[PDB]
Each structure stands twice: as C-alpha cells, then as structure tokens.
Amino acid sequence: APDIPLANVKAHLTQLSTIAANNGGNRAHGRPGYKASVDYVKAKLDAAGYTTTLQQFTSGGATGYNLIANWPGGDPNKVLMAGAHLDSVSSGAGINDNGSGSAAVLETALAVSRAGYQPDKHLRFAWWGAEELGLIGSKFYVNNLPSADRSKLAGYLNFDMIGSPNPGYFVYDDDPVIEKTFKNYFAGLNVPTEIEGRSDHAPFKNVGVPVGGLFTGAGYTKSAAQAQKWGGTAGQAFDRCYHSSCDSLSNINDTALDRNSDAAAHAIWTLSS
Ligand SMILES: N[C@H](Cc1c[nH]c2ccccc12)C(=O)O
Ligand SMILES: [Ca+2]
Ligand SMILES: [Zn+2]
Ligand SMILES: [Zn+2]
C-alpha cells in the first residue's frame, strides 16, 4: 500500500471547511453544504476514473444522497467496501466528524488510481448522507442492496472521526481478519491500540457483512492510562468540539489523521488481495 500524503488529506478538509462557510456554516442533510460536499468528492473521483453513482433518498422531508464509487474491475463476487459519512450536524462544519474519515477514504480512493492498483476484489467506496439523523443513508443503502449483492460483500470498513485532537487509537472489535489487519499496521508503528449503532458500519454488521474500522474518540474523557500510552490530556474529551461549531480545521490532530489515513490504505490494499 502507498503512504497516504497527509497534506492531500488536509487539503480535502480545507475544501470541506470552505464549503461549510459558503453554506450557512454546516454540511448537514437537507442543507446546501451537504450536496456541495458530495459534488466536491464526486468530481475528484470522476476525474480519477471511478464509476460514480448518486443514490438519492428522502428523509425528514428533504432529499439526501449517498455517493457510491466503484473502481472498474476485480472479482464481482468479492467486493470490498470502505466508507465514511459525509454529512455534519448543523451546528458546524463537521471537520473531525466526519470530514476526517471522508477525506481519508477519498484520498485512499485517489491513491488507488495513482498507483494503478488492480485489486483482486472489486473495490467500492461510499460517502453516506444523513448519518447524523440516525444512519439514514447507510441504512438506505443496505436496505436497497439486493441479497445477491449483499452476499458478494467481503467486508465493509468504516472511518468516522479519525483526527480527534486529543486522540486515542481505537480499532473496531468486529470481524477478526479486518481487526487484525488494522492492529498489525499500528504494531509496525509501535503505536498501541485499544478495542472500540454508533456509525455506518451498523447496518452492514446487522445483516452479517464483516465489518471493521478506526476511531480516535468523541465525547468521552481520555483516562490517565490512555494519556500515558498516547499523550494528550487526561480528563479532557478525545474531541472537545464534538458536534460543535468549533469542529473546524483547528479540531484535528495531524498525527492521528496521518496514521489512520495510512492505516485505511494499508487495510484496503491488504484485504482486497
Ligand atoms: N456518534 C458518532 C461518533 C462515535 C461515538 N462512538 C463511536 C464509536 C464508533 C464509531 C463512531 C462513534 C458520530 O456522531 O459520528
Ligand atoms: Ca502518510
Ligand atoms: Zn461521525
Ligand atoms: Zn456525529
């Protein structure tokens, strides 16, 4: 797998920040900042060679969208998916929640094209709408994916809040192979990890698709032992700006975003062979 350039991930975050500022301060479902976010990500993927689909749904009286991007080729009976919700709450720009995961998944998708990678498994990336309404976009996707296509899914990897400013390094404790792949990446860095309905992997998990993911913490407070292993500040939230107007470009830990973006790519490469 390639090393995902941190600067490229941060440049996507800058673009999402600007989109929020241009659209009433947020990127929330039903509001123009969300669809502008979708248009940004879709344009980068289309230029890289992806087959993109805008999947529309209605929730709360407003049109929502999922962005699905298929990398042409690979075994159609073995699909590896990775995704991230692209909506924010309406109080702010949602840069850590969940620009961070959205930008890491986008840069990994772009890295696939730059590397000329041809995975054995077919690769599909997704950016979910309306996660903050209750996983509505990922539920819509799973609910509308026929059972023959669900059975072709080898895994779903989720990335939701991966740049928290006072981070932990949490790995989902779900499918054992996906979990081992992430934990092995961090082991090679000599960075400890801890085991993690809270995000878009839940609709996949609930229908028996193997899932896993990365998380750097939200509203809970970092313990003394966690500050010993990862630095930062004991007694403060992992993300002091969770769901807040201050979930801005200032609300990112660059080391965590870099490591988790690199880990995302490592897992996507490893699990697609
Ligand atoms: N509620 C999620 C953030 C979140 C909190 N705990 C977890 C565990 C696993 C994934 C995500 C989360 C959100 O608003 O994005
Ligand atoms: Ca990197
Ligand atoms: Zn989130
Ligand atoms: Zn959230």
Domain at 2, CATH number: 3.40.630.10
Question: How does DSSP classify residue 222?
Answer: P
For the Cβ of 229 lying below 6 angstroms from any atom of ligand 1, the answer is no
For the Cβ of 161 lying below 6 angstroms from any atom of ligand 1, the answer is yes
Mutate to test the pocket of ligand 1, among 26, 128, 199, 238 (most ligand atoms within 8 A of CB): 199
For residue 202, what are its two tokens? 């839940």
The SS3 call for residue 194 is strand
Q: How many Cα neighbours within 13 Å face the side chain of 120?
A: 6
- Domain containing residue 228: 1-273
For the Cβ of 247 lying below 6 angstroms from any atom of ligand 1, the answer is no
In the chain, where do the E strands start and end?
A: 51-59, 62-70, 75-85, 121-128, 153-159, 170-171, 194-195, 211-215
Residue matched to tokens 């990897």: 157
Instruction: Output the CA 104–ligand 4 centroid distance in Å.
Output: 17
- Phi, psi dihedral angles at 222 (to 5 degrees): -65, 130
Ligand 1 atom 1: the closest Cα is on which residue?
A: 198
Tell me which residue of 80, 107, 91, 76 sits closest to 12, measured CA to CA. 107
The CA distance from 273 to 263, in Å, is 16
The CA distance from 205 to 79, in Å, is 15
Cβ burial, residue 78 (10 Å; 0-12/13-18/19+): middle
In the chain, residues preceding a discontinuity (C to N beyond 2.5 A) are 196
Cβ atoms of 190 and 184 within 8 Å: the answer is: no
Across the beta sheet with 194-195, what order do the strands follow? 51-59, 62-70, 121-128, 75-85, 153-159, 211-215, 170-171, 194-195
The SS3 call for residue 55 is strand
Name residues whose C-beta falls within 8 Å of residue 71's C-beta, 6 or more positions apart in sequence.
Answer: 49, 50, 51, 109, 112, 113, 119, 122, 123, 124, 125
Ligand 1 atom 7: the closest Cα is on which residue?
A: 198
The CA distance from 123 to 204, in Å, is 16
Q: How many Cα neighbours within 13 Å face the side chain of 179?
A: 12
Instruction: Output the CA 163–ligand 2 centroid distance in Å.
Output: 13
Name residues whose C-beta falls within 8 Å of residue 192's C-beta, 6 or more positions apart in sequence.
Answer: 169, 186, 229, 230
The SS3 call for residue 64 is strand
Cβ atoms of 267 and 178 within 8 Å: the answer is: yes
Mutate to test the pocket of ligand 1, among 87, 157, 160 (most ligand atoms within 8 A of CB): 160
- Ligand with the closest atom to the CA of 247: 4
The CA distance from 99 to 161, in Å, is 8
CA 120 from centre of chain: 22
For the Cβ of 196 lying below 6 angstroms from any atom of ligand 1, the answer is yes
The CA distance from 188 to 184, in Å, is 6
Distances (CA, A) of 12 to 6, 107, 160: 10, 8, 15
The CA distance from 89 to 243, in Å, is 6
Ligand 1, atom nearest to 219 Cα:
5
Q: What is the structure's resolution, reported in angstroms to one decimal?
A: 1.2
Cβ atoms of 80 and 268 within 8 Å: the answer is: yes
For residue 195, what are its two tokens? 């085991």
Mutate to test the pocket of ligand 1, among 198, 215, 221, 222 (most ligand atoms within 8 A of CB): 198
Binding site for Ca(2+), residues?
3-4, 258, 262
The CA distance from 52 to 57, in Å, is 16
Q: Give the total number of structural domains in the chain.
A: 1
Residues belonging to the active site: 131
For the Cβ of 218 lying below 6 angstroms from any atom of ligand 1, the answer is yes
